[PDB]
Write an enzyme that holds these catalytic residues in place. Sequence first.
Site, mmCIF file in Angstrom:
data_model
loop_
_atom_site.group_PDB
_atom_site.id
_atom_site.type_symbol
_atom_site.label_atom_id
_atom_site.label_comp_id
_atom_site.label_asym_id
_atom_site.label_seq_id
_atom_site.Cartn_x
_atom_site.Cartn_y
_atom_site.Cartn_z
ATOM 1 N N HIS B 41 79.277 22.740 18.875
ATOM 2 C CA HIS B 41 80.619 22.231 18.578
ATOM 3 C C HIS B 41 80.932 22.185 17.060
ATOM 4 C CE1 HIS B 41 79.610 18.105 17.455
ATOM 5 N NE2 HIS B 41 78.854 17.982 18.542
ATOM 6 N N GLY B 143 79.171 11.862 12.503
ATOM 7 C CA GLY B 143 78.303 12.522 11.539
ATOM 8 C C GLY B 143 76.860 12.648 11.999
ATOM 9 N N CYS B 145 75.764 13.919 14.864
ATOM 10 C CA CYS B 145 75.530 15.065 15.759
ATOM 11 C C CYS B 145 74.484 15.984 15.166
ATOM 12 C CB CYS B 145 76.825 15.817 16.050
ATOM 13 S SG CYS B 145 78.084 14.825 16.892
#
Lengths: 305, 300
Positions: B41, B143, B145
């Site tokens: 993503h 942040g 991820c």
Amino acid sequence: SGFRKMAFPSGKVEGCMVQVTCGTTTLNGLWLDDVVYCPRHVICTSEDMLNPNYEDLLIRKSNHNFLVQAGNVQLRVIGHSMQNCVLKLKVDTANPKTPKYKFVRIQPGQTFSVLACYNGSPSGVYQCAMRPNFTIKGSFLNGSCGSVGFNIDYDCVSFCYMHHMELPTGVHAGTDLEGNFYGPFVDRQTAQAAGTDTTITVNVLAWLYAAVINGDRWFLNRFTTTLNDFNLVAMKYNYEPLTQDHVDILGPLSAQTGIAVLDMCASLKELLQNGMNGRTILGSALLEDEFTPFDVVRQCSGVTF
Amino acid sequence: SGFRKMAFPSGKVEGCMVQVTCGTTTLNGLWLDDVVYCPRHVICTSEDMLNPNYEDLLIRKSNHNFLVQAGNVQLRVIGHSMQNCVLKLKVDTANPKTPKYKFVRIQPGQTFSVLACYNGSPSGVYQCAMRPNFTIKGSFLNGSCGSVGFNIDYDCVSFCYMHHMELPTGVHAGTDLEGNFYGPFVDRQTAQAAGTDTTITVNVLAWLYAAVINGDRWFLNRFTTTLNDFNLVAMKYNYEPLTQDHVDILGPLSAQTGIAVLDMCASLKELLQNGMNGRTILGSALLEDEFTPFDVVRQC
Ligand SMILES: O=C(Nc1cncc2ccccc12)[C@@H]1CCN(Cc2ncc[nH]2)c2ccc(Cl)cc21
Ligand SMILES: O=C(Nc1cncc2ccccc12)[C@@H]1CCN(Cc2ncc[nH]2)c2ccc(Cl)cc21
Ligand SMILES: [Cl-]
């Protein structure tokens, strides 16, 4: 979202863990620059521990009596000295992995991360608090002596604890990195007991603020209290007194959540006098006191190292 | 003595954390050998979150669109590929700090350590379990991820999780290191909800054995139960069924404490019926389910 008991990343400390063997005893050492720090009881036998004269035992030792192993490499000891309850073994090689570091002595209520080690090898990391009775409720087996407690400030490791012993209740006692014990403990096999423990009030309040930041608000009430009235109630339930320093430290969390410290103190007062009533706060049925106000801000704002 | 929620030392994983930036999005990557793994993503914009076509978006990207930063050094992306929900960015430098590692997909109930990161920098380490509903109850902000879950087997790191998203209830969803999601989740902003969570029964029993090893015996009783009668009671408290595999796994703790698994099951039924009555077990007023039988043996 989420709130976890979180330790500092242990990498900077892992690169300092070494194995220290003296006779039959093997424990952990902290290798910083050209010195290996470890508990002075490594020079003891089971008889020596009963009533030890560490100056007399250390004077009989030579550098070759201490076997220091960093990974699969043996370090050569070129000197030995004692600073309070810590033994300092001068080695020929400076630890290339030595981070920026400080030796700091912490106060009760302050939290720190423990890198539990066995045979100079890190096996686990956990976050805990120096209890008001100066013990730590750690998790340690035989061989863990010399495991260290630390905090990380930007890229600087502040070493604050070195594990020395387990008390009969299963709680732990140790020293700062200058060998001074936290609490009224001695490094000898004798009758020693932890004092009656109390709850770290400022930390409970910081954890209540973390619960509010996470959406848990059921415990909030319309009430406020004086600091004096709160302390009279808190003292009755074996809670540490809340000082004006503590109220000031909770300032940013109070500003962020819109709940004054004395307003949160009234929630804590009701929680103490009435219980949780089958409810939980951050998935806990007990009030958590091992998160400082700084830990809550650090976790709820994502500070990195 | 003592029992703590303990994470693995995070050093071997810290040396692999890098920052991955693609356009306006910045998240974490795992740099192993000459490959940086991160959630796919990272290639998504605003119109590409409800229904992204990742193959379509990735084909439009070039290596120079990906900015990889390891410390204060920028790595050069020389290739990119997608494996399920993970993006693999081939770089021109092998990570010298690459530990011995494995990619392992875990089952619900399994625990792991999470190294929470922001901008490729480790900020904390904590312990998690894969919930039976395949979510994890982490502590993650925007942040995080690309933060990874792992276990350490002697000197080998088994990477088992990569954080991808937060569900509306505040719980977290992610994938193994081959990009396969744990649970019925997708990496889209579509309406997604975690299933009803249940307590990991085998882990509670392992934690009750840890309490006995530590001297806490107040909850033990003279009763035993059949596995079937235990499961009928357990189900009513939203507890996972205990299988014969679980009973076998608890064998060493049963042998060490002298308390048969079905005997400890009867203690657990009594606790579910009575509650704790102002008492604690290992300093906890609730039954702890994030310690596996393997964790208990290792720690004790
Ligand atoms: O308590 C000690 N460390 C340990 C650290 N953490 C957890 C533990 C769990 C289980 C066993 C030992 C643990 C050590 C070994 C045990 N004994 C008692 C003793 N008697 C004669 C010689 N040693 C003492 C007594 C005093 C001191 Cl300073 C140190 C020690
Ligand atoms: O949820 C995400 N990560 C985060 C991880 N951990 C904790 C968090 C806490 C607060 C905010 C974000 C967190 C990311 C960024 C946000 N959104 C939700 C969305 N996308 C477009 C509109 N709203 C999505 C949606 C899908 C996926 Cl795969 C990933 C993501
Ligand atoms: Cl603060």
